[PDB]
Ligand binder design. Sequence first.
Ligand SMILES: Nc1ncnc2c1ncn2[C@@H]1O[C@H](COP(=O)(O)OC(=O)CCCC[C@@H]2SC[C@@H]3NC(=O)N[C@@H]32)[C@@H](O)[C@H]1O
Ligand SMILES: Nc1ncnc2c1ncn2[C@@H]1O[C@H](COP(=O)(O)OC(=O)CCCC[C@@H]2SC[C@@H]3NC(=O)N[C@@H]32)[C@@H](O)[C@H]1O
Ligand SMILES: [Mn+2]
Ligand SMILES: [Mn+2]
Lengths: 235, 235
Amino acid sequence: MLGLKTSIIGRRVIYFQEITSTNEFAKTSYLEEGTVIVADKQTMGHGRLNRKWESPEGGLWLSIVLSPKVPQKDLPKIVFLGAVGVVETLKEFSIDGRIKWPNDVLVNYKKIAGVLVEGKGDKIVLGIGLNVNNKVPNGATSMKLELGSEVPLLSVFRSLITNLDRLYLNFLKNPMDILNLVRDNMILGVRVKILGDGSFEGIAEDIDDFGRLIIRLDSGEVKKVIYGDVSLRFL
Amino acid sequence: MLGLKTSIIGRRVIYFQEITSTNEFAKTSYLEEGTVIVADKQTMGHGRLNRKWESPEGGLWLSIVLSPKVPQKDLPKIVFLGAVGVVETLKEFSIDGRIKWPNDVLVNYKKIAGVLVEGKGDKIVLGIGLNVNNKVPNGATSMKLELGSEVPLLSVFRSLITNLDRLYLNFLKNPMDILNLVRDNMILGVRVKILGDGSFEGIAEDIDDFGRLIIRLDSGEVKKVIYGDVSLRFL
Ligand SMILES: Nc1ncnc2c1ncn2[C@@H]1O[C@H](COP(=O)(O)OC(=O)CCCC[C@@H]2SC[C@@H]3NC(=O)N[C@@H]32)[C@@H](O)[C@H]1O
Ligand SMILES: Nc1ncnc2c1ncn2[C@@H]1O[C@H](COP(=O)(O)OC(=O)CCCC[C@@H]2SC[C@@H]3NC(=O)N[C@@H]32)[C@@H](O)[C@H]1O
Ligand SMILES: [Mn+2]
Ligand SMILES: [Mn+2]
């Protein structure tokens, strides 16, 4: 009845009035490639490193089951597929979303969406959380808060699935293509601070051919940040 | 992201771009009560017995999982809940549908929808087929044809599912109410013929407290017809 016309992502969709977490459901359940798990609200929304994600009604909370037939070295680029997908859909709604390494999309430096990729094997779960018409935590923003008016959620859904379908199909073909789109749409050239084992500061200049963030320290030293147990902050 | 506000029916919806039969899928896979199985297109549409149900794009093909734990005798009224439901949403779109015993709803005697309930284990699958914008078989009709314009498929979906939910919740408490609604919306007082070995004709008088069709043959003899492999024809 939805009439989706995408090739893989969205071949099926399981909608929930509410769920604990779409990622948890997708990881746990036996689902086929391309199945999309979406829910009005999550009671146990999750972010990275055991962080929790507010998921009240009005936002877009979905997860996509994937089985990327590409080399294991490319898997980390999947988080970017999500990130660019959102950016593209925000641009469709004339919202200037910008990517923040490693998994965030901001509007005027205020987070409007999160992206979390979990699992491995032959089943990757692409989790996405965009604020649309829902209330959001302090410091964050939403499509509705950006346009000054409510946005038809189902329209945002169709737009995102459509972009992700195209992005994903091309990624299976050319796994490198995504990083060009990531560069063009990521927040670079500004001072950033990296928290992992200890921490350091410098300018985030670009992402290399592995999606790793390249930081140039004041000492002229250049570090390559790989996403894992790490956090990025703007100065 | 659908924002459905149903109590039971529509708590979860599993959409497919394509499927064999939503009824069969709903029968073979464990699903929770209220789960709705819907597809843009069915490849193996199913009618009663071994009849096929055309299910091209543009129509509404869905099945709902139920386990109403009320007396066994009432179980057969499920089909009517589906038909009355279709009749209700049709009126919402200004179309007057009429229930043809036992599982059909006609619009000026042209079949616009059909209902098919299958009882698997102690789980009951209510199957519904409604023609909306799709191509229909010769002799049949669709909402698009009655209105002369395309109808937003999702709008009809929301409408039917809120209606069924309401009808169902009351069924669980007052399983006897549904019959009245059927009598008020069924095609009776007319001449019909019931086919099969033992075929006969008569006036379709009323519907039993069991949902049986009461027929008055020209002899004055009254037969109570149960829906099995009997075929109802209008003369
Ligand atoms: N609704 C919201 N909008 C903006 N920021 C939020 C937010 N809710 C929480 N936050 C903040 O963002 C941080 C989380 O950031 P992270 O970078 O680690 O994590 C993320 O940004 C990923 C979020 C992924 C959410 C989706 S919803 C569909 C799927 N099902 C799930 O359970 N999860 C995924 C938190 O620690 C908060 O400070
Ligand atoms: N699209 C259509 N519109 C009107 N009539 C149709 C039609 N497709 C087929 N027919 C005719 O209607 C007859 C079928 O009548 P019956 O009374 O037996 O059967 C019905 O009227 C029940 C149809 C139930 C359809 C739904 S779709 C969702 C679910 N998944 C399934 O696989 N099935 C259910 C056929 O013999 C055809 O002649
Ligand atoms: Mn983040
Ligand atoms: Mn029939």
